[PDB]
Design an enzyme around this catalytic site. Structure first.
Site, PDB file in Angstrom:
ATOM      1  CB  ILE A  10      -0.912   0.002   1.247  1.00 43.11           C
ATOM      2  CG1 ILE A  10      -0.152  -0.039   2.575  1.00 43.11           C
ATOM      3  CG2 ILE A  10      -1.841  -1.198   1.144  1.00 43.11           C
ATOM      4  CD1 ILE A  10      -1.066  -0.075   3.822  1.00 43.11           C
ATOM      5  CB  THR A  14      10.790   8.772   3.592  1.00 41.40           C
ATOM      6  OG1 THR A  14       9.716   9.684   3.304  1.00 41.40           O
ATOM      7  CG2 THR A  14      12.123   9.454   3.320  1.00 41.40           C
ATOM      8  CG  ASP A  82      -2.650   9.585   1.422  1.00 40.32           C
ATOM      9  OD1 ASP A  82      -3.545  10.081   0.745  1.00 40.32           O
ATOM     10  OD2 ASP A  82      -1.601   9.161   0.937  1.00 40.32           O
ATOM     11  CG  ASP A 123       9.227  14.969   5.822  1.00 39.44           C
ATOM     12  OD1 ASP A 123       9.157  16.016   5.177  1.00 39.44           O
ATOM     13  OD2 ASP A 123       9.289  13.862   5.296  1.00 39.44           O
ATOM     14  N   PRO A 126       0.682  16.053   3.371  1.00 42.93           N
ATOM     15  CG  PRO A 126      -0.768  17.453   1.943  1.00 42.93           C
ATOM     16  CD  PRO A 126       0.680  17.159   2.366  1.00 42.93           C
ATOM     17  CD  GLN A 127       2.389  13.515   0.510  1.00 41.54           C
ATOM     18  OE1 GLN A 127       2.242  14.626   1.028  1.00 41.54           O
ATOM     19  NE2 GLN A 127       2.319  13.317  -0.816  1.00 41.54           N
TER      20      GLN A 127
HETATM   21  C1  LIG Z   1       4.870   5.658   4.820  1.00 40.14           C
HETATM   22  C2  LIG Z   1       3.701   6.618   4.511  1.00 40.14           C
HETATM   23  C3  LIG Z   1       3.533   7.563   5.744  1.00 40.14           C
HETATM   24  C4  LIG Z   1       3.971   7.383   3.193  1.00 40.14           C
HETATM   25  N1  LIG Z   1       2.445   5.838   4.346  1.00 40.14           N
HETATM   26  C5  LIG Z   1       1.555   4.968   5.064  1.00 40.14           C
HETATM   27  N2  LIG Z   1       2.171   4.603   6.242  1.00 40.14           N
HETATM   28  C6  LIG Z   1       1.486   3.819   7.133  1.00 40.14           C
HETATM   29  C7  LIG Z   1       2.097   3.495   8.456  1.00 40.14           C
HETATM   30  F1  LIG Z   1       1.156   3.096   9.304  1.00 40.14           F
HETATM   31  F2  LIG Z   1       2.941   2.552   8.219  1.00 40.14           F
HETATM   32  F3  LIG Z   1       2.707   4.568   8.892  1.00 40.14           F
HETATM   33  N3  LIG Z   1       0.224   3.367   6.897  1.00 40.14           N
HETATM   34  C8  LIG Z   1      -0.490   3.663   5.749  1.00 40.14           C
HETATM   35  C9  LIG Z   1      -1.848   3.148   5.557  1.00 40.14           C
HETATM   36  C10 LIG Z   1      -2.577   3.473   4.354  1.00 40.14           C
HETATM   37  C11 LIG Z   1      -1.987   4.305   3.277  1.00 40.14           C
HETATM   38  C12 LIG Z   1      -2.789   4.498   2.002  1.00 40.14           C
HETATM   39  C13 LIG Z   1      -3.661   3.445   1.421  1.00 40.14           C
HETATM   40  C14 LIG Z   1      -4.526   3.599   0.258  1.00 40.14           C
HETATM   41  C15 LIG Z   1      -4.518   4.881  -0.418  1.00 40.14           C
HETATM   42  C16 LIG Z   1      -3.624   5.915   0.100  1.00 40.14           C
HETATM   43  N4  LIG Z   1      -3.520   7.124  -0.570  1.00 40.14           N
HETATM   44  C17 LIG Z   1      -2.784   5.760   1.278  1.00 40.14           C
HETATM   45  C18 LIG Z   1      -0.593   4.830   3.500  1.00 40.14           C
HETATM   46  C19 LIG Z   1       0.188   4.540   4.713  1.00 40.14           C
END
Ligand SMILES: CC(C)(C)Nc1nc(C(F)(F)F)nc2ccc(-c3cccc(N)c3)cc12
Length: 294
Positions: A10, A14, A82, A123, A126-127
């Site tokens: 998913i 970074t 996100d 850091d 939005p994402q």
């Molecule tokens: C590493 C980063 C912060 C870019 N992303 C994500 N990190 C983590 C976490 F729980 F591991 F932090 N959990 C996440 C859970 C879901 C998503 C996600 C899933 C489907 C669509 C979008 N746009 C984001 C992104 C995540």
């Protein structure tokens, strides 16, 4: 790790990919981050371990750290999306204002909690703000940021974004404060009302000059000290400050008071999380639910 059915990729962090996984012990669903390789340092570990006890409703929960021979696994609660994707979906619409200040209010609670224990995120973007279908939003990668990082490429060679970085960091200060995260949150706030990023720089000096074109080139009156910063140059162009009612139409007046206080140059003068939570803008804060596809 063996107790985790990996379900779906998913994302690219970074530091590593993130899978959705099932814990085959507990039956829970989980976000599994898989970080680096050899040989991961003691201090990273000690720091990250103790993030397990930094808990709040608006920080995503760190369920466990696994260090194995020789990668790091972080397993987190699972959130379905996100903020960047939700903004893109809300494009013709704009997120409604009630839901904008709900989210801003929650992030601002999560931030106050972290800063009372002196942890910075540093850091914010939005994402790594994550939302659920019940209408909560949460801060992800807290403390990771400055346990490892921040690279200008990720492990995928992706450029990391500059858009939300505070000016003292761009001007080469080493010893910045929790005010860093307030700058970033304010950029995100403006991006939600306008549906357009506030300062979309594509190098440090572009980023920096985009801030100057809008808020004026800073000087010693508005920011005591500027002139001494490592990467300050006498030769920076001097732009004048823009009238703030065209930067963020059509926020009302309480929204622009708050925003500009989150975007003061001098990091001693800009407003804290705690103080922000008292601002008149939040006088009528609701708790909207996004309803959402999943
Ligand atoms: C590493 C980063 C912060 C870019 N992303 C994500 N990190 C983590 C976490 F729980 F591991 F932090 N959990 C996440 C859970 C879901 C998503 C996600 C899933 C489907 C669509 C979008 N746009 C984001 C992104 C995540």
């Amino acid at each position: 790790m063996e107790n985790f059915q990996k379900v779906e990729k998913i994302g690219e962090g970074t530091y590593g990919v993130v899978y959705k996984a099932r814990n085959k012990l507990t039956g829970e669903v989980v976000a599994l981050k898989k970080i680096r390789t050899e040989g991961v340092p003691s201090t990273a570990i000690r720091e990250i371990s103790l993030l397990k006890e930094l808990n709040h409703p608006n920080i995503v929960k760190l369920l466990d750290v696994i260090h194995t021979e020789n990668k790091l696994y972080l397993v987190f609660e699972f959130l379905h999306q996100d903020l960047k994707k939700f903004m893109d979906a809300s494009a013709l619409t704009g997120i409604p204002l009630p839901l904008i200040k709900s989210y801003l209010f929650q992030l601002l609670q999560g931030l106050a909690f972290c800063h009372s224990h002196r942890v910075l995120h540093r850091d914010l973007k939005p994402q790594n703000l994550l939302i659920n279908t019940e209408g909560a939003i949460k801060l992800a990668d807290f403390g990771l940021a400055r346990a490892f990082g921040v690279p200008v490429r990720t492990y995928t060679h992706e450029v990391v974004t500059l858009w939300y970085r505070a000016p003292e960091i761009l001007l080469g200060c080493k010893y910045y404060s929790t005010a860093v995260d307030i700058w970033s949150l304010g950029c995100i706030f403006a991006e939600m009302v306008t549906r357009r990023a506030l300062f979309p720089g594509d190098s440090e000096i572009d980023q920096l000059f985009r801030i100057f074109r809008t808020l004026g080139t800073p000087d010693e009156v508005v920011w005591p000290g500027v002139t001494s910063m490592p990467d300050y140059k006498p030769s920076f162009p001097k732009w004048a400050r823009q009238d703030f009612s065209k930067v963020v139409p059509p926020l009302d007046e309480d929204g622009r008071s708050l925003l500009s206080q989150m975007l003061h140059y001098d990091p001693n003068k800009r407003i804290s999380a705690k103080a922000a939570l008292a601002h008149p803008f939040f006088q009528d804060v609701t708790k909207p639910v996004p309803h959402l596809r999943l």
